[PDB]
Amino acid sequence: GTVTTSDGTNIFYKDWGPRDGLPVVFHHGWPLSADDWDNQMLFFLSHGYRVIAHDRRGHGRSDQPSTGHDMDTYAADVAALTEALDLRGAVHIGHSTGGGEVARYVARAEPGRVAKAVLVSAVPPVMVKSDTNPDGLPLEVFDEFRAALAANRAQFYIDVPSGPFYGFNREGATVSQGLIDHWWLQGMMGAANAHYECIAAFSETDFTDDLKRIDVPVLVAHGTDDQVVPYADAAPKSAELLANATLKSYEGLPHGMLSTHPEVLNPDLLAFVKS
Amino acid sequence: GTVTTSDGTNIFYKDWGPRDGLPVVFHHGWPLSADDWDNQMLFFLSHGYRVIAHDRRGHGRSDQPSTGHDMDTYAADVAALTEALDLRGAVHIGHSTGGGEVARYVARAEPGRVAKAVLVSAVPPVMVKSDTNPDGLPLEVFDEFRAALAANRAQFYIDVPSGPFYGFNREGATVSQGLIDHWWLQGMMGAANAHYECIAAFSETDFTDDLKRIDVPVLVAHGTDDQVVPYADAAPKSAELLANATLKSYEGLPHGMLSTHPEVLNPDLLAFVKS
Amino acid sequence: GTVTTSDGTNIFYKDWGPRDGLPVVFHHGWPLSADDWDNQMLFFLSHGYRVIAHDRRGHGRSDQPSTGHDMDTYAADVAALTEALDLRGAVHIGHSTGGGEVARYVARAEPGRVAKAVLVSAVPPVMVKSDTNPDGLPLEVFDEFRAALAANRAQFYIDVPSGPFYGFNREGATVSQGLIDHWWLQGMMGAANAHYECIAAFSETDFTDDLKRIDVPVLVAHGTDDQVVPYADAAPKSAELLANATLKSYEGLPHGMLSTHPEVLNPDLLAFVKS
């Protein structure tokens, strides 16, 4: 389906499963699309849930607008979607950049919209190194990403999934060429301007205040060998700021562990959704 | 263009060639799209035919609805398109799973809408082993496709076209990386739930009754080294059940022979459409 | 965004940047899409311009109509778009086949619509060999393209970008696998019939009279080792026929130079637009 937001942007979404099922809403990372969740959507569908996933503005099949590439607009786009579908008691699961979108939307959501949230390999509290965050990554790492994306996006999108994203640069790791090709295809369908601008939106936005307002139970899951969103500056810190958080650490797993190790993660997600 | 079906699903279709030419409609297999017919669409166009091809629901550029992944809905979606275009005297060509859709649509079509039909490498009568079909394939063959698709669809869709679909695993075959990569792209564009559910629809639906209902002339074509839809349980059985069928056997050709050997097949399809 | 033309064809386009920015409109080459301009769009956006690029009919995300695959229609589709956006004083940049479409559009544009144009590695004045153009390429070259495209588009779309398009067949060239894969993707998304018919459109159309009617400043840029649109029969001839043209030759650069050497071409495009 599609949902039109307040500035006229059409957002594409998938909505599968029982109309009466408990809604599980998935928020993809950068620079991907709702199709990055195939495995988890089939999994949750098989357990009877209703599964919903949208393409962020400028990504996948959604429109490619000139503006709105920032976390507040992203969270507002989610609210347009959940209001259009009139979702109640949904579970929101966000990966990477999508975990920041989830944190901001759940902090601002209308009552009864959300029951639980899951932040997987997520960006909060804040990634960039600063006064307030001495353990963050320097701005130069993100300048690098911006410069390579602008210069030859198609090559940059082979390098990322080939190296750090799924940990395929680690000696002995089982490599899947299909995961590399699929990441590149999802990224090439989206907009160069949205992908370029989103880098600053995921790495420089402070979600500390958002996390402080979340009162529903939150599962915080992260792999310890994450080469994209450093584990120590994210997971433990987010868990400490949330009122009702469960922290799960997966030794040796990468940033895209939902696709490389779904047999480890999926049972832990279903347990939490059922608790 | 697109056509809206009774449940509100939008179906993408192509319609090229003279508006008054005889219509030849192409039905793609699993898990592809209308783009699998490029070669045959240009070949028929060059002989002055009007050439139509749609993306099955949940495939290519069509919508990805929650339900309707079954042969009865697929044939009703075909009727929705042929009614919107008001086709008369059309020739329907179906490959693989599209051959099952053709058999069911043609058996139920309003009289005058169809002139002739062609089943290439098609699934009928019935693939799976049952009480009525002991030479069929065991269910476990299909349970493996389901499990590989659900675990890592992007890698499973490299594995199928690299191996059995086009016979590139046979010694001495001509391998085209282009055919592999195009199969993968068309597959990854479609929906994971549609592709998953379709496996039961193409392999367990019994088309025996549809086949007994068809009265127009039917060309049944099939490669004898078909590693996806086994030759002996399909083509000769279909031809024996159809009132007016012509059986064409192609020694040593694979399941995707319309793309690996179009120079052999195209003239034979053409002869049939002109007869 | 999308605009519907007067024959009902939908054309997709992107429009990014300030609303009061001078409009720089990009016209991609054969058989590509608006996405071929990612580098140049982010570059001009970073200098405060509004940047616009559409998918030619039968290409990329635009519809795939039966007809209209000719330069007169391509220039009327551009007129339809610039009227809908109400562009005034735009700069039109065209690559390859897109440079012929820019010449035709600019020659017929309404008063006030165009300020300047840029023809990069463009097809004017006329490619095909004849009595009028003794240095053209023989019709046989384009007949081979037609034949390879119709036989196996998927494989021909790997061969073109792998050999001649980007000069990767030259000893010592730095090959980018992402450039190859992206060319192929953009090509496979477009229509086989449009791509096939466009070959005659770009190689056989004589743009001599179009060039003689253009009176705005025109930059004619061309690589001297262009293996798709030979330099000697294009750039110098176009520059002689234009009233106010600046010719820039790039020694040893390929047809795809905007993507292989953007650090060389982008400065020159910007200096032309600021002049």
UniProtKB/Swiss-Prot annotation, chains A, B, C:
Active site annotation, chain numbering: S96, D226, H255
Domain AB hydrolase-1: 23-253
EC number: 1.11.1.-
Pfam families: Abhydrolase_1
Bilayer-crossing regions: none
Primary enzyme class: oxidoreductase
Keyword terms, alphabetized: Chloride, Oxidoreductase, Peroxidase
Record note on quaternary structure: Homodimer.
Stated family: Belongs to the AB hydrolase superfamily. Bacterial non-heme haloperoxidase / perhydrolase family.
Protein name: Non-heme chloroperoxidase
